[PDB]
Amino acid sequence: NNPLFSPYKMGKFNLSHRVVLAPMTRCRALNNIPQAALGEYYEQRATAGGFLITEGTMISPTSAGFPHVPGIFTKEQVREWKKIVDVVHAKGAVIFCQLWHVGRASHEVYQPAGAAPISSTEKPISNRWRILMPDGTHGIYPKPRAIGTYEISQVVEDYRRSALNAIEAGFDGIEIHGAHGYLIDQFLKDGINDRTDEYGGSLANRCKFITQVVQAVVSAIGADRVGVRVSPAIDHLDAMDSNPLSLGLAVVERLNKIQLHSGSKLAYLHVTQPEYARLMRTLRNAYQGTFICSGGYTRELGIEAVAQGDADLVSYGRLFISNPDLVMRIKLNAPLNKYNRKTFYTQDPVVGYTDYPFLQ
Ligand SMILES: Cc1cc2nc3c(=O)[nH]c(=O)nc-3n(C[C@H](O)[C@H](O)[C@H](O)COP(=O)(O)O)c2cc1C
């Protein structure tokens, strides 16, 4: 009947349905340590056979540009994440940790010793955009420091080590955040990447960083535990490309080759809808594997996406904020409850986080 409740084999993982929790930063992980509130939040949304992706999670002390986002680069963070993974696995769900480096989308207040954020480029995000500060005001993005290739290789090692830490905490896998104008996208997009070395210029060079990140995590934990998220067609944080479809296809070609070289498929490719329908289907058709679509989906649009072959899985963000039982509501076609944008990024462990009710 409802194709969202057709089972799906996501490689090693047997899913009972196709409704996915999209990664969402919520800023409840005080001092970058996962908290009991995150356990309650993910437990509420977990279902038997359902797939969850965490909020973006720091891979290193320089990787953050939001307040109170979790990390997975210290043993303390690993120990606390395990408690969260455990309550999600108790409900029979599958959960991946999203690994997130913001690059130049940061601020002195978020950096050790107030050092400059790192990027592909020395140019700041323009003041068309503002950063959320810890006090809830909006600040100015600073000038970043363009990193050399040794430092690039050390960032890759931060992804690799974080992927191993995620597996130690019990996560089923990880997702590489290569979207939305953050560090990887600062190398992908020719509206940002002004390098004249082997990581800039040509499509091949701009794709080197994501390829190396993905290959490192695949070697460390196995391709079937790795997902990759990208967003070729956007303007967020000035992340425009002159040819988004060609950039997306170049990325897809690199993922297909990583799979051929490794003898195994990635867990999935995850693409968010252009934000400033053909592009989505074109990347899906080009990719040898599982495709998760995201961005503006509703019950009806997700049913259509799976029914028409546009995606294998559909991820939902904002509707999962305010509907902890979103999966059940979609199954029953029960009315969905609104979300309160004001409390997307506040620190309260309950209000606007775990106090959205279930169906009566
Ligand atoms: C509050 C909030 C936080 C988000 N944080 C992340 C994040 O940490 N990583 C990421 O890749 N996307 C993040 N997103 C984007 C969502 O994963 C998702 O693509 C978007 O919400 C999908 O559209 P929808 O809300 O209409 O379902 C966030 C979105 C929202 C609204």
Whether 348 maps to a domain, the answer reads no
User: Looking at this protein, which amino acid is placed at residue 105?
Assistant: A
Say how far apart CA 292 and CA 2 lie, in whole Å.
17
From the candidates 41, 110, 159, 182, which is the catalytic residue?
182
CATH number at residue 16: 3.20.20.70
Cα distance between residue 165 and residue 227, in whole Å: 16
Q: What are phi and psi of 124, to 5 degrees?
A: -75, 155
What atom of ligand 1 comes closest to residue 344's alpha carbon?
1
Resolution (A): 1.6
Our count of domains for the chain comes to 1
Q: How far is the CA of 272 from the centre of ligand 1 (A)?
A: 9
Sequence-ordered alpha helix ranges (H) in 27-168: 36-45, 75-89, 149-168
Phi-psi region of 352 (alpha: psi -120 to 50; beta: other; left: phi over 0): left
Classify residue 323 by its DSSP letter: -
Both tokens assigned to 86 = 């455990």
Sequence letter at residue 166: A
- 8 A C-beta contact, residue 228 and residue 214: yes
Let me know: does 303 contact 263? Beta carbons within 8 Å. Answer: no
| CB-neighbour burial class of residue 305 (10 A; exposed 0-12, middle 13-18, buried 19+) | buried
Neighbours of 281 (CB within 10 A): 16
182 is catalytic: yes
Report the chain's C-alpha Rg in angstroms: 19
Quick check: is 357 in a domain?
Answer: no
The span from the CA of 283 to the CA of 269, in Å, is 9
Dihedral (C-alpha) 71, 77, 81, 83: value to the nearest 10 degrees? -160
Phi, psi of 178 (to 5 degrees): -110, 30
Residue 149 located in a structural domain: yes
Which residue bears the tokens 């029960």? Answer: 334
Residue nearest ligand 1's atom 22 by CA: 295
Range of the domain at 133: 3-343
- Looking at residue 234, the DSSP 8-state letter turns out to be B
Q: Pick the closest to residue 239 from 129, 360, 111, 349 (CA basis).
A: 129
Residue nearest to atom 31 of ligand 1 (CA): 318
Q: How far apart are CA 122 and CA 129, in angstroms?
A: 17
CA angle 244, 245, 250 (to 5 degrees): 95
Residue nearest to atom 26 of ligand 1 (CA): 296
Residue with CA nearest ligand 1 atom 13: 24
7: left (phi over 0), alpha (psi -120 to 50) or beta: beta
Amino acid identity at 275: E
359 falls within a domain: no
Q: Would you state the torsion angle of the CA atoms of residues 88, 90, 94, 97, taken in this order, to the nearest 10 degrees?
A: 40
Residue 360 is assigned to a structural domain of this protein = no
Distance CA 2, CA 287 (A): 25
State the distance from the centre of ligand 1 to the C-alpha of 20, rounded, in angstroms. 12
Tell whether 358 is covered by a domain: no
Measure the CA angle with vertex 148, ends 147 and 150; round to 5°: 120
Provide the 3-class DSSP secondary structure of residue 76. helix
> Would 214 be classed as within a structural domain?
yes
- Strands 173-178, 94-100: pairing is parallel
Q: Are 83 and 128 in contact (CB under 8 A)?
A: no
Q: 50 C-alpha vs ligand 1 centroid, how far in Å?
A: 18
**CA-CA distances (angstroms) from residue 277 to 4, 144, 284, 311, 322?**
20, 34, 11, 12, 26
Residue showing tokens 């002004």: 194
Q: Which of 156, 177, 344 shows the shortest CA–CA distance to 271?
A: 177
SS3 string, 140-186, reads CCCCCEECCHHHHHHHHHHHHHHHHHHHHCCCCEEEEEECCCCHHHH
- CA distances for 337 relative to 28, 174, 320, 326, 360, angstroms: 22, 29, 10, 9, 12
Q: Does any domain span residue 289?
A: yes
| Ligand 1 binding site (Cβ under 6 Å of any ligand atom) | 22-25, 55-56, 98, 177, 179, 229, 272, 294-297, 316-319, 344
Task: Return the residue matching tokens 């939305």.
Answer: 180
